[PDB]
Amino acid sequence: HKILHRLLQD
Amino acid sequence: KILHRLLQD
Amino acid sequence: SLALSLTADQMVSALLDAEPPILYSEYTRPFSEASMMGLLTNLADRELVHMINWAKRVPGFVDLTLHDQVHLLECAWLEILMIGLVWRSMEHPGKLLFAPNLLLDRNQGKCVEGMVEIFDMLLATSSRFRMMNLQGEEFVCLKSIILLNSGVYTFEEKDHIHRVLDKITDTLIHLMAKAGLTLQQQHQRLAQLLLILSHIRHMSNKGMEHLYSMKCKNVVPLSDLLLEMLDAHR
Amino acid sequence: LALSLTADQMVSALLDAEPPILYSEYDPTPFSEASMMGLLTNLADRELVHMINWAKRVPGFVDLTLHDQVHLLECAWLEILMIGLVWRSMEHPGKLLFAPNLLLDRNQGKCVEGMVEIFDMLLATSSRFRMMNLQGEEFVCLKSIILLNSGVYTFLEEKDHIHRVLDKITDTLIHLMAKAGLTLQQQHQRLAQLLLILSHIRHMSNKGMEHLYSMKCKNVLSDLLLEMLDAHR
Ligand SMILES: C[C@]12CC[C@@H]3c4ccc(O)cc4CC[C@H]3[C@@H]1C[C@H](Cc1ccccc1)[C@@H]2O
16 A cells, blocks of 8 residues: 555545 | 876876 | 647646746754654655646646656655755755755755755756756746656656757747847757756655655654655656 | 768767677676676676767767866766667567667566566567657767756756757657658657656666665676766765
């Protein structure tokens, strides 16, 4: 899991 | 400085 | 696929509209090494959040899968921060405008060690932009090129990216022809702009080293997001 | 001097200046990490001697002061070695032709750690040149651009001389592409595609320097080579 993943979907 | 020399010719 | 359809003019407007805002530094007393580092890593961390939302607004970037979007941002994030810093420092010769309330000269780069070298390289890029009279329309094209180019050769998905890169190239030429430049001046200026990206890449690699080294010697904690973008270059 | 040149004479002058393809001491009688790396660094050291004399033939380079000639070479020497390796590897998919007797795939670049990553990057660059069907006349232009550009902003009227020559090389690339029958739109696009690759070559060189300085300390190896490094230290 990456924070970068989350910010790209939000 | 080797490069200095090889450039000097 | 919509990035392809756009006119040169629509590409410029779409990029200018995507532009992230100029953030402020937390500042205010004279700088120690650890305080200088703290202000910069705090600023970079907040800019990262805005860069990620700017990237999604770069035409054709949403058409990529999530895995590729992560890869391109992990590879280019410092380059993108640097070209932006260089851009907004154009009308401040000899100084780096990290933030409107954080304008630094190279003598203030001595506060942290090895910082001066990157400083002079960054000031040199800003002096190059100023000498070329880099336009804002050209700048936003270069920044998105960095985003799509820097990590493309470390992956059907390339073809799209390459087709978008060609579209941005057409946009650059279109801006120069609109500016009255002759055909020869157009491809010469196009080459001069893209060669600067080689130096921005160089500054980024040296910045990664400098960021990783003073990370292991632990003066200020880095945010987990910044720490993850940095660990991707290992 | 260099501002004189015909677009066609620019090409032929660069083609004539091309250094030779050297051989390694590779004896296929497997190697080790130390031995395989010994061959590579031995080969790079001998290529440096030719690159220096090739740089003297690059138009406009001799017009530079000896201080700036050293600087441009100290910054670009590994970039120039890499683009040449990538160039002579175009016709060998999944393999790097370090020397006619030294052709390697990524599985053998594993012998040294972290070299696998640089190997894939060099292979990806070579595959990109093959996909674009890079021409030798375009290659010699790019290699000379690296020599004159990579160090230009680490260096007043001497800079403008370098940028004047760089502009002429840019004119040459366009001249070649228009001669190949490309539309004006296709020329600008191809010009951009070639120059963006130099950003990745710069990246491979930066990581190559790290892998290199690391084993200057690890201490498994040339005087001229150890001296090129400290400049990037
Ligand atoms: C100063 C710095 C390069 C430039 C970075 C940057 C660029 C644009 C921008 O808008 C914000 C920033 C903030 C981060 C900047 C980098 C930090 C780094 C120096 C450093 C600071 C703290 C610990 C280790 C190393 C490194 O040397």
